[PDB]
Design a protein around this ligand. Structure first.
Ligand SMILES: CC[N+](CC)(CC)Cc1ccccc1
Ligand SMILES: CC[N+](CC)(CC)Cc1ccccc1
Ligand SMILES: [Mg+2]
Ligand SMILES: [Mg+2]
Ligand SMILES: [Mg+2]
Ligand SMILES: [Mg+2]
Ligand SMILES: [Mg+2]
Ligand SMILES: [Mg+2]
Lengths: 323, 328
């Protein structure tokens, strides 16, 4: 099932505060991911002229989020991830109305199909060439999957994140998670993995893997929340950037200190990882002839949680705010 | 704080003499005889309505531990208790018929019954024997609730339809649940949770404002899962049998866990028991937070927050020995 990734040794993992229980692997082409991050940084500055994104001491976020992706596709998905981070950081700092407008106008640039002329502010107008250029690169590698991925970057993320009204006050984990799925862009992320692995999941495929994706989606999102809480909380105080984080929700609705809320979220995460293993075991026990691409998918999502956990445990993006 | 008025605590030895495992304290409405009389009234009316039914042998709220309505409505005065107990028993009897019907005809029967309770008078049935039977079945309870509280009775009946009868069962293909999330969205409709709390509001003569609902959302999150999954835990054996022997749908979180985690029945039940005890502790933590954050919380909202916890415990306790679940 493994082709493009290599395992991180226990001896390396123990040097970090990682606590994931799932297997940690990294794309073998980490240098390609780093080059893609440098390209995104250069292009952002070239087109906008105005950061702590995927690069870290442990390796590039793209090499951990896309472990089983060949290098030409890794360069695309890493670049799109970094472009998304750079955009999202600005979005979190803007007034809700203007933040929403920037999200929607940015998302319209990713539509792979012809659109009638529309008005767009300076920021989206300056990024239009950037987005069309990367779409052409993706299409040249894989037309149908490239167009699908770009369509979902909008439909799964930019068109929905932020909701449509005032900034909500989260009074339940259920309501938090509905908002956070949109805000995290989870419905854009899995299509990027599909593009990276050159497999389009069928509707029937998605139905079969739903029991695995249930704990996986919560785990991947709440793993970011766990590791990014300190920096998000600091930023919210220091400049008003919006704090969207399950640790914060637990702090509030359970009257818990930061450390008590973190301890609770850690237990949720480890339990979700073990639940994923049980849901996955059940799929194997009940599908003796599972197609190879679906076997690959259900295995890859587990290492994707593990790898993004591992990266987040040390990344400058989450930890450089206080040395 | 002393918030109890119409209920009394159940004795520790009585509790230990049952398979109950709720971690929350157990109380019962002091007017159990009123609840039992309401159940018998529902059985009589349903028997007049239904050809060839179980009549007086249907297994609904009456038990040796007490009446389900006395446990589900512990803080309700006797006049209102008779109303909500009757409507709950009628709902159970109707739902048992629904569960035994093919899916689409069951849905149709679910919408038609809900229309009887719609204050907006939509979906009128065509006149005839069927319509006359349904009109007779519900006529007295419709008058009685309005005569005791017009404002809250109209609201309660509107939600008996809108929360439950109008939505339970969905439409189209019967689902094959592949996640607890998907299950719970369907189960909230099928259980009628959005009809149940309005009945409690009617019983306690208190309408929760929109503000009130936002404030208690952190408490209602674990409470709603607990009340529904508590029924699922205790009713699995009957529902599993009915699905196998008679082809009824199986709508039960124990079954979802059993399937999607490839567990034995006993392992699936144990997993759900752990979910339940954890939800009860979570309710306590959420409730403590509300009190810490709202020193001036209104008395009616404190009562509501405490009542929902005893409602989970009491319906758990009843279900641990209830004949419906154990001698069906
Ligand atoms: C908003 C999410 N993200 C990182 C996942 C910024 C933090 C960009 C992104 C969005 C959607 C898919 C992939 C990356
Ligand atoms: C919906 C079926 N029920 C739910 C408790 C028995 C499980 C009766 C009922 C119907 C409508 C409102 C409240 C209860
Ligand atoms: Mg964000
Ligand atoms: Mg952010
Ligand atoms: Mg974050
Ligand atoms: Mg039912
Ligand atoms: Mg039933
Ligand atoms: Mg049941």
């Amino acid at each position: 099932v493994w082709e493009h990734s290599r395992p991180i040794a226990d001896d390396t993992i123990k040097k970090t505060p990682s606590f994931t229980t799932l297997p940690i692997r990294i794309n073998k082409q980490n240098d390609v991911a780093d080059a893609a991050t440098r390209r995104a940084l250069r292009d952002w500055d070239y087109y906008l002229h105005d950061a702590l994104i995927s690069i870290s001491e442990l390796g590039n976020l793209g090499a951990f989020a896309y472990p089983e992706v060949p290098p030409e596709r890794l360069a695309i998905v890493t670049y799109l991830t970094d472009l998304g981070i750079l955009h999202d950081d600005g979005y979190e700092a803007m007034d809700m109305d203007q933040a929403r407008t920037e999200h929607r106008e940015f998302g319209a640039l990713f539509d792979p199909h012809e659109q009638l002329p529309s008005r767009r502010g300076t920021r989206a107008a300056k990024l239009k060439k950037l987005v069309s250029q990367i779409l052409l690169e993706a299409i040249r590698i894989d037309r149908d999957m490239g167009m699908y991925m770009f369509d979902m970057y909008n439909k799964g993320w930019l068109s929905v994140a932020g909701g449509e009204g005032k900034v909500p006050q989260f009074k339940s984990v259920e309501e938090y998670q509905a908002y956070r799925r949109d805000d995290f862009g989870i419905r854009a992320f899995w299509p990027m993995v599909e593009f990276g692995m050159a497999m389009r999941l069928s509707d029937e495929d998605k139905k079969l893997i739903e029991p695995v994706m249930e704990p996986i989606d919560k785990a991947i999102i709440w793993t970011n929340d766990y590791w990014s809480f300190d920096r998000e909380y600091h930023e919210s105080i220091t400049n008003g950037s919006r704090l969207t984080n399950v640790v914060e929700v637990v702090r509030q609705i359970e009257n818990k200190s930061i450390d008590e809320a973190k301890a609770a979220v850690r237990q949720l995460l480890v339990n979700l990882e073990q639940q994923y293993l049980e849901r996955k075991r059940a799929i194997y026990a009940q599908n003796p002839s599972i197609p190879s691409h679906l076997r690959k998918w259900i295995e890859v999502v587990g290492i994707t949680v593990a790898g993004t956990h591992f990266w987040a445990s040390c990344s400058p993006r989450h930890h450089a705010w206080r040395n």
